[PDB]
Design a protein around this ligand. Sequence first.
Ligand code: BO2
Ligand code: MG
Ligand code: MG
Lengths: 222, 235, 211, 233, 231, 204, 195, 240, 244
Amino acid sequence: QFNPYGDNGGTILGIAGEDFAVLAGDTRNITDYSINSRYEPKVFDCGDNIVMSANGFAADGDALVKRFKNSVKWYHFDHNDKKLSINSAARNIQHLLYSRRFFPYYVYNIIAGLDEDGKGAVYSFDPVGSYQREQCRAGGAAASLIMPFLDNQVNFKNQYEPGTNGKVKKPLKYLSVEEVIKLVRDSFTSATERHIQVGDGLEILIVTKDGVRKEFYELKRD
Amino acid sequence: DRGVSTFSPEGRLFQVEYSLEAIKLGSTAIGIATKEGVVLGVEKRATSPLLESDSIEKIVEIDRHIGCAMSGLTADARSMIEHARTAAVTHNLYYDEDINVESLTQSVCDLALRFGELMSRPFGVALLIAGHDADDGYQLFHAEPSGTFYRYNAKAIGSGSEGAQAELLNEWHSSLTLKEAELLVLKILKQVMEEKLDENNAQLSCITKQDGFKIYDNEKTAELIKELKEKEAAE
Amino acid sequence: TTTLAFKFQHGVIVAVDSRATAGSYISSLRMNKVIEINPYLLGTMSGCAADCQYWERLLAKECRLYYLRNGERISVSAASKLLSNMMLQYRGMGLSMGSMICGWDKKGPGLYYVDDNGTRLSGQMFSTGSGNTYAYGVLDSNYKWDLSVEDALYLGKRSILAAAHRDAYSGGSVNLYHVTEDGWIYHGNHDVGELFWKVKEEEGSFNNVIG
Amino acid sequence: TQQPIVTGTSVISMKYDNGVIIAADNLGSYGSLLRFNGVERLIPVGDNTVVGISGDISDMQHIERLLKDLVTENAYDNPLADAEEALEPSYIFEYLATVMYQRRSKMNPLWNAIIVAGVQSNGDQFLRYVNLLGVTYSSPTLATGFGAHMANPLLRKVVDRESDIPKTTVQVAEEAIVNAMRVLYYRDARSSRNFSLAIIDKNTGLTFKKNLQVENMKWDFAKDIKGYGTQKI
Amino acid sequence: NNYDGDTVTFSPTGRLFQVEYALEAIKQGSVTVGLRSNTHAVLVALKRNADELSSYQKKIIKCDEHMGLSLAGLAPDARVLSNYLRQQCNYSSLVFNRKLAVERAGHLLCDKAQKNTQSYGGRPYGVGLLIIGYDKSGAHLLEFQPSGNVTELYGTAIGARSQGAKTYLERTLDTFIKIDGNPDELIKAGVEAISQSLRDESLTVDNLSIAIVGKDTPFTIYDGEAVAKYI
Amino acid sequence: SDPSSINGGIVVAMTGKDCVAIACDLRLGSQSLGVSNKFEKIFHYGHVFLGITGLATDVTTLNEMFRYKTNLYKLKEERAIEPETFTQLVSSSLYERRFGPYFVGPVVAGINSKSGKPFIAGFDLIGCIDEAKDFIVSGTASDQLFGMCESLYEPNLEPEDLFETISQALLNAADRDALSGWGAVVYIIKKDEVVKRYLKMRQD
Amino acid sequence: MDIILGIRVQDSVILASSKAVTRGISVLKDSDDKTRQLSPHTLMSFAGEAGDTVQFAEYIQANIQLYSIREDYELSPQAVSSFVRQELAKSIRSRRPYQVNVLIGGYDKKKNKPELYQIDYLGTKVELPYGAHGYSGFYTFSLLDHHYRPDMTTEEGLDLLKLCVQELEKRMPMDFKGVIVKIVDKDGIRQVDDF
Amino acid sequence: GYDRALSIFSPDGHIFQVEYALEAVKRGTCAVGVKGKNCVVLGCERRSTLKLQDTRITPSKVSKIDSHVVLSFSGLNADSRILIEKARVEAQSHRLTLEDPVTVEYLTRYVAGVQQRYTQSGGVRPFGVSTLIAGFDPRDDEPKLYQTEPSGIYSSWSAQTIGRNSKTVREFLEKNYDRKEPPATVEECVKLTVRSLLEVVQTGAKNIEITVVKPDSDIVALSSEEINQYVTQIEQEKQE
Amino acid sequence: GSRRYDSRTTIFSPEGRLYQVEYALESISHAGTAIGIMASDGIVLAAERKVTSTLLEQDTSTEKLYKLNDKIAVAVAGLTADAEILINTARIHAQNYLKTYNEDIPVEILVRRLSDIKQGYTQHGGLRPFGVSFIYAGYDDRYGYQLYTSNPSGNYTGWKAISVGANTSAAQTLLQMDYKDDMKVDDAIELALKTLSKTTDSSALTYDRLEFATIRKGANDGEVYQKIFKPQEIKDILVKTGIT
Ligand SMILES: *[B]([O])([O])[C]([C][C]([C])[C])[N]C(=O)[C]([C]C1=[C][C]=[C][C]=[C]1)[N]C(=O)C1=[C]N=[C][C]=N1
Ligand SMILES: [Mg+2]
Ligand SMILES: [Mg+2]
């Protein structure tokens, strides 16, 4: 029997700062126990200061991104070159995903950028179109490895202030872009060690009011 | 006979030009745009005193930030309003935001030339679409059955249109207040109307950023009519 | 998931948890399971997140259009029925949605249960999701029509806590709402971890748990 | 939904400093029967692209006709059909990828794995893969079927990453490809000794080699192997 | 006369009057100018207003990052045809990862307009278009007539009083073609060309509309104070 | 599960000398549960009689359908339909649902008004005609009815003798079937008189 | 849903229907009215798959109400029951059949007679003195077979109905949360508020 | 399918087919609607050119759309049946999807929309019918009276008439009907409705039909004798 | 294109009349007269065949009176071919109603259905209307004996006595004169034949130029019988009433 779905592995990570956002993802593409590519880009600049990554089944991921990029183009044509806000893009993507409710895009999708007040924003989607704004989200193969670490090191969960013994929590101080990128790199380095589908390379896209910047880092190739 | 989509020797669509004649027979509708809001006003024109005038609905809400006035064959406007309301709310569903006034107007105008041998004839009604959005602010559009739409600082449509438009030519300036615009619509309506203007045979409305689209009460309009009479008698 | 809603003398209380699961993995700690359809209408979510979000947001489109056409707010009864009819179009196609439509209208406060089968039930009190049995236990023994707004908010909050504790697929935080004739009022996000310890000490409950 | 009947095995390829190389054997298998021995599975499109196809041969012949028609259609009302508006490898690939993904979305796939190898207008090397699922990826080396498991490891020893491409000559690359084809003949039970090889260079153009054979094989050591453990005679 | 009732009827001399009447709608429309060099292509359009309270009708429409047009005649028909171009440009990108050639875009418009001239019930398009673009064979300028005829040109003009601008470009042919790597000078030549078609009125800040595309220049439209530089 | 044996029931028809007889049980059930003891399975369209066994909804549906068609036939032809013609109509109607059939076992019985010849016929659920000289059986006790009819029947029986034979064939077949019984009816048919008799039988 | 009973006495028809609605392992409601008034002298109770029941009932209700307005005339219970049967017989061969069983209790004002019809989801119609759907009849028919007379009063019909419900409450494993009882007679439809 | 555009604009901006449909309404028998303080009355003319008629079975001029709304008309009789049927279907469809009966305003808006649709759809001609729609909204004691016409426009009326010689009876209503104090009782409302028809009808025998609609679905049609008593009392007061 | 040749069958005149309906009525006014008379104990249908021949086979002929079901019959005036199209549709509608509700269709409901079909041809489709006028004679248990008529406009009305076809003006005056409410079938039979005998364009009214039918409760006990009269039976009733 023909199985129209497949798993190309990969892992992605979005973190929302105070006035910035990052969307990272490994560059490894796989089927079963083979490597297809050690560098196959997965996070894309979709225009209007929005970055996107559809992780899971590559063919459905490429199709969704392609369609959203197309949706941005037609949003300009139809509404006098108006900038597509991140919240509007998120809602648009919900309807793209649900149009195939009975033959879904097999991808966990994340977009990142800035909201209309200039603050950092991350939105996360399930394959059938449920979405929600978040401060922190790992998606894909090693999502279960990374998220607990981010709960601890980004939202300071289960961390209290010494001397009080559980009475007073650790205050939720904001993180800088340099601090966030450290957590991203350590997340993927740890994930690479214990997950066979994660490795080869790490590509990070950073979004600010100035625009979209890229950073690349090598990962273990075994 | 002849085709419905036929061009005249002058390069105009016969049916579109003839629908414009039907709009000239319609009751007057006036719109004025200011930096404090857009005002919409209409002549109700009841055919008999037994007709309950408050049932005459020639000013209509499309969304909270968009209003609409009509003139001509007003029965034709109902499907246009239904499309406009659907377009406005559907865009809110797809994009989690208000829709631009221009984009709404463009969507309405796309219906216009969907006629042939689709509907069997063009619409016999003109619309004044007034609204506000964050990008272009307070706006007033005139949507014709030709599929064309012009933006206006002020505009009059209907039977007393060319006389009212000449009056709007002189009176409008970029520093008009909302209160000044209200009185100006009432003034020009009173000038072109056959019967004597009062709160029962004329209606006012406005769109502001804060309160959105509002149709004025007959008590509220009555005070603005009394305020108009006194200021005209003042000199 | 645990959601509840009940009518009382001063309107209707709406309380939900915030947990989302993908198998045994907790995918979300803070999922919003209430939808603000309009200032006088609420909708709860249980089952498939995608289905709940899509169809209740589509209900909001259709409830908004009702206001524009009629110049008047839609009833809770009519809103709930529009939703049930949507479910009836995709009859047997595999949608998973359990929702309570809560609001205030001309008949007073209104509460309707609606699910993917098309079932539509009017009632005073409902609870949906994997932890509804735990919530019903607290609700049934403590509910009265003569409840104060303060006590009613606590009952719904305490009922979710009961379910979040026992049910593995319920937890995270509690979102509270109170629906009046002037509209719904949000009564905040309450972390269960902190709420549990607080309730334990103040109420004396959960004696078997050590803290 | 179908099942593949007459099939073609591995297609292997790699980038080098001035272009790309691609190769595939000339066999059309019918299950375990090595039925057809004269099947060309490399199909040139113009003088700048070679499409290598594995999987179902009837679907391959269908794709071959689509490409032939694509060339015809591109020439229509096109005075620059043999110049600026000629078909590029990227155009040809994206077309196929569109077709493959549409067919899988109708639950009626073209049961193939395709590698498009070529050189673009600006001299850039093009090498990308697509299969029955519509899955696409690119890499300095690409291979289908068994080639993925046996050829890629050998070819990745020559070009392990992007920076190794300018350091790799056409002689070294062809040597690696030809060695890989020998290894596949040793170890793939649906392979043949006869194969075709194509080089697309930005300077010397398209070189298409037919009727190649696997040579310099090691078999002599077989004489010393006796029994399966204890047997001495 | 007796042969102008519909588009499906030839006259005794072999003329199609409905098509000719559609051509007449273009002549009534406001003037627009097109011209190109080897590096850039420019559109210049005189926008028309209803009155002093009204806005000035937009004349230029973007079709892709590398292509767009200006209109003269029925604006809704330009919206339909420009929408079609947008889709065709977009089909070329999504399927073939290929920017649509300007010459092929002209061929597609020709064939779309033609179907309306040979069938009963429909009508010809009542608008003329000037398409500019930059593709793999450099800069291009096309003139579209709703008869179906599409023509590639160095420069041209359509609309009311367009003959004045067309004569100017015919004199200036050898000069403006050589304006390579200088967008501002090419626009100047276009603004000077459209000026030959003006009577009574002159080019103001909300009257003038300019568009440009080139080698390292995406199709961009200039309106308002952005064209005050060229007045 | 099996549609032809959910509701239960039987029909039998016999030819005699210048007469025919058609009989049926009165049971309607939901498998083991007996629901009705008044569910008659024999209908008539003019002088042509039709008995139908099988799924009860289809029995009711087909009766209403053949009433529909015979009433139009009569308006156009200006005469009542004959057994031979009706038999072809039943076959045509059943085969038009070849791949979504009515789960029934029809039996036609009557006397041609012109020739005076007795006529009976049986069908399978999809239209095959069995035009027997002696007898036709249908239902959940068709095996039992075959055994009774094949032993008790003899040709050229007089109406009042034929009554006893068909009655005893039905009754004893029904008493060896769990899904048949709960009453019985017998129609005795002659060229211009028809008598209907309800039989006394065990009600278990 | 679960339980629906019907009994035709001398001058009326009495319908009894369970109040429970269950989802998963929880009883969501214990006051559900599983019935719709089709016309002033015709009542239909229903039981079957979730959702389908109400939507079918309301669809039938709308059709009969439409007929009543068009003709300014109430259809006989027999005519209504035949219409309902046809809709179900139509439904059973559909892509997705409506899984609904019904009892139609009506008073024929022309004949001055009460009438009870039992129709299952296949479109199997039978006129009866008393009827039920599902397993309900397995427990109750033995009592009805014994005690039922056609000359019974409405009060005697209710007493026999109480006995049937008591037997169900004793021997059924499921808790159906009691029944809502409604009477259909010459004066119309009314609900017995204490049972 | 037949797609021919029958309703089209003329050079002077008129749609003649819609205007000729109004001429069919002018030909139709007179219909009148008057709303009192707590009721609405619908009066209808019956032309006495047709005797030997069976008044039991002949289609009545006033039609119930629902239990709380009625519809009368003037114009082509056959055309009116199509509008009535559609209206009746929509009334049950509204109850089914929204769980409330239609408001009189909604039902009017629907019927008016159907009429409008037939003025710009291919292959169809406009309805040669104008309607008077009356009733009371659910749980409301305010009377409602609306009018529609072939073009598709509709509006609310304190009192209105349509059909042949409607110009005359409208003249009567305009001078007799006071807005500040409408017919306080059923008697006064019926009396004024009969009086208005007596300006046009001819004989007050079987030529006048009256239908009273009160709140909470209380609709009744008066008989010949009941109406005849109004006719008697009116003329006896007139002899002075 | 094709527009050139379109007659436009479904349009209003400037006066607000439907051209084709009016012209179809003009056609019907030349058709043989048909009369219906309703009595307390039954209904009579009488109709005149148009200028026949001696070589016409009368006993197997039917151009005027048709049976819709056992309770309802119709008399035709106009194009016979058009009438048969509608008659077969009406027969099907009656059977559909019977299958759905298991009751015979009420007379008015059948009449309304046919009249609605006629109406449709005047409002949409671009086809010519049916050039037919019917007189419906029927019985049901709601209203008892009923007479209706329908014409190409799709408008229908109920009657105590009515005529269609030729000379209806003269015929209706004669019926209005002699008709009374307490009338019986045997009297109505006489009135129908006397009216035809005076309005006919023929020299004399004979059996071979007539079709006749009655709907009586004169059937054994509470039930209704349709009687389509045979040529010999029409000849006898003509002698009985004293016309020949
Ligand atoms: B709750 O459990 O019903 C919850 C409500 C929803 C609105 C978030 N649903 C889920 O947690 C489901 C799984 C499930 C668990 C228990 C009962 C029913 C369903 N998960 C999701 O909807 C989901 C969606 N996207 C990503 C992860 N999980
Ligand atoms: Mg690893
Ligand atoms: Mg037994």
